[PDB]
């Protein structure tokens, strides 16, 4: 029987994941294992494990990692952690196959540790390009260091064969986290309210801030100064990620709720079924988050997406590209106010039907 | 003035290094610093930070990594040593530019080390095609982290724009380590026989047969008997660095020593200048060392490489590939005794040259093909 060993280090990329562990996981030939770690085990980030559990899974081995101190120094410090403790997490496991979504630093580590280790990679979301981040530059060292490759379009899939990887190896399958629209029940507003103790029956935006880390100076102020000049609106905030860089967004978010505390619902971190909820209700998905590129434009709702953590992303006419600039954001969010499916099925089957056991040669382009 | 620091991890990346460090060193409007680290520290290499300090280098910071265990977990320890070690020695470090050279995992460490730090990274041999265990994947990883590039050849530096890197960061600039055959001074016939007690002036063959390890139950059979139906030829090696079967080597190189001692000369470790006097004037270099498809060519001397250690490096005129089969191996030897892209040997200037009039302090864009 195969082992399909799924990682997952944040809330939103096991959200993504769901259903892919959820089919393994309900698949009689195949034994899911889940390496949980980063984010999942911090406070600060709401301690996320107790949701894998809670939705029925079994998480086979966790490496809590990432150190407080918030500097790019403690951040490399926190991958050599995380490695260390790969090394024997995955020595214990003996996945046959290791699945890494996306981009962030703990999937750089483990990605590495699983090559040395001989544990083939298959990698979810390769050949995109996210230019403000260094996400960018370990998306793509991940896919160099990756067996099988699931891109979610077909410019995906093309950007990866030119990254040298064979042409048999890469799968054009769609966004894995676009199934939760068919697979998922939404939450209703009154039950969103109950949850919350808040009321989401009146206009709102939901805002993911993560620090833009190839960004030298970072100053957030014109990001909440245009938020305090909107009448009218509810602002419900989710937390930041654990790059360096994100503790000057919490106190920022700790101050525009001190400032306006009927106004202001920060959420440490919704399960992706409320996420999803609260997402869909909103006037707009304001920030600089991924889902501003992919959720928020498959469930019809406006984004204003801000600076460069995701500049190179395909775009689409529900897109408001906007400079950190009080002015630029003001004006975005005041424009907001005044106007397939089966992809885990696809996953698995490539996985139960091809062998992708040893690394493929590069692929020079003819 | 800018800080230029250089990682090293391998007395043989050292040496491939060593004259990009000299210059450094001797050019007063940049600062060298040197982060030391992985096989450096290693017992069973004898200390090599030692000879760095030697050679007139200051080591500015340290970073002892490698676990004792030849376990796949152990590897990825190690380099969580690395990772936390690197952190502090960067930190320390305020370097304007980390030179990282090749493809090993401590050289992937030091590279998303400083791309999360904001070091901008100067990544010398990407684009090469070279099917180890994993190191082909490492070494293109790494170039996906670093800023400029810094590749050996032509076909190289196409690869890495294919890669995605932007072309005006990509210098195909020769092999640095080539730099030793234009700045070395030989030692003559003479001078190298009163030094090993051994007559040079008669032909001879300089081996270097590395332990092949992806060829296990290694069998050298059709490689020592392939020597000894060659008449009239001394026979002249060092010793095959510490690999998993180097005794199978050690032994069957003594084999031939006590069975010829008068024409067989088993060698210490040369030392850069004396094994680039002693290949320079060998009837070729036979084996499988990387020395085989860039020194000797450099140097004039046909070169007969063996098995497939050196896969997927560029072939040219000079060189001729056998198999590990007796009757191919001698049709070689005999008559080649009959007998310009990885550059001359003035890459450290070029590097030099384009590190201080090009600005990569951040990754460019990437760069698709049209
Ligand atoms: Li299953
Ligand atoms: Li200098």
Redesign the interface.
């Known amino acids: 029987m195969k082992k399909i060993a799924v990682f997952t280090g944040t809330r939103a990329e096991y959200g993504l994941l769901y259903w892919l562990m959820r089919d393994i996981q309900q698949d009689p030939e195949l034994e899911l294992q889940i390496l949980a770690t980063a984010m999942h085990y911090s406070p600060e980030h709401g301690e996320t494990w107790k949701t894998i559990v809670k939705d029925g899974f079994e998480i086979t081995e966790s490496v809590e990692m990432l150190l407080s101190s918030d500097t790019?120094?403690?951040?490399?410090?926190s991958?050599?952690?995380?490695?260390?403790g790969?090394?024997?997490a995955?020595?214990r496991m003996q996945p046959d196959v290791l699945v890494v979504l996306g981009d962030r630093?703990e999937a750089?580590a483990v990605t590495?540790?699983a090559?040395?280790?001989?544990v083939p990679v298959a990698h979810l979301h390769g050949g995109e390009?996210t230019?403000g981040a260094?996400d960018?530059?370990?998306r793509?060292?991940?896919?160099?260091?990756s067996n099988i490759h699931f891109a979610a379009a077909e410019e995906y899939k093309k950007?990866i064969i030119?990254?040298?990887e064979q042409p048999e190896r890469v799968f054009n399958v769609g966004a894995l986290g676009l199934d939760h629209i068919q697979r998922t029940t939404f939450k209703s507003i009154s039950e969103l309210s109950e949850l919350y103790d808040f009321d989401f029956s009146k206009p709102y935006f939901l805002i993911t801030y993560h620090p833009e880390t190839?960004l030298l100076e970072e100053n957030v102020a014109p990001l909440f100064d245009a938020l305090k000049q909107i009448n009218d609106v509810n602002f419900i905030f989710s937390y930041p990620n654990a790059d360096?860089g994100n503790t000057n967004i919490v106190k920022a978010m700790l101050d525009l709720k001190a400032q306006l505390p009927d106004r202001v619902l920060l959420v440490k971190s919704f399960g992706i079924q409320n996420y999803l909820s609260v997402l869909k209700n909103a006037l707009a998905m304001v920030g600089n988050s991924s889902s501003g590129l992919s959720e928020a434009p498959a469930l019809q709702v406006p984004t204003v997406n801000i600076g460069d953590r995701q500049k190179?992303r395909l775009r689409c006419e529900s897109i408001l590209d906007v400079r950190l600039d009080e002015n630029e954001i003001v004006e975005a969010l005041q424009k907001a106010i005044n106007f397939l499916g089966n992809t885990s099925q696809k996953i698995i089957e490539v996985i139960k039907t091809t062998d992708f056991k040893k690394?493929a040669?590069?692929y020079?382009?003819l």
């Open positions: 790019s120094s403690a951040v490399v410090k991958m050599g952690v995380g490695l260390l790969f090394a024997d995955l020595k630093f750089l590495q540790a090559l040395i280790m001989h390009i230019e260094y960018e530059s370990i793509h060292a991940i896919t160099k260091m950007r030119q990254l040298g190839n360096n190179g690394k040669p590069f020079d382009l």
